[PDB]
Design a protein around this nucleic acid. Structure first.
Length: 70
DNA sequence: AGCCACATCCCGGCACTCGAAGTCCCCAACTTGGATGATTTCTTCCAGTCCTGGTAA
């Protein structure tokens, strides 16, 4: 089903490393993809963690995004 | 060696004591024997309603 897979391929455009909408769903615009900052000895942060991505956009997609973003 | 600034130092001076009875010492502080049985601990029915999405067809 090229249509089902096409709808799934489209979700890739909004995979991100950092989520600009987290505290408030009203924020509108582009995604953010950045490598973790250099480690600071006195601070707990993403600097000590491996690279991972997530997904946010329409409520409807949830299932269709799972093929490539898992 | 002679001259000047700044430290303190000791005598004359000053002010206070201050109303107005005493109130007992010393050493000791208990051993033993037992704390109960038999029975039972509730049942009927019920457990609100409405407002407060973003995104794309």
């Amino acid at each position: 089903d090229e249509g089902h897979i096409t709808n799934c391929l489209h979700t890739v455009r909004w995979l991100h490393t950092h989520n600009l909408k987290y505290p408030d769903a009203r924020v509108s615009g582009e995604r953010l993809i950045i490598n973790a900052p250099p480690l600071i000895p006195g601070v707990i942060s993403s600097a000590g963690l491996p690279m991972r991505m997530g997904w946010a956009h329409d409520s409807s997609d949830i299932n269709l995004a799972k093929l490539f973003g898992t």
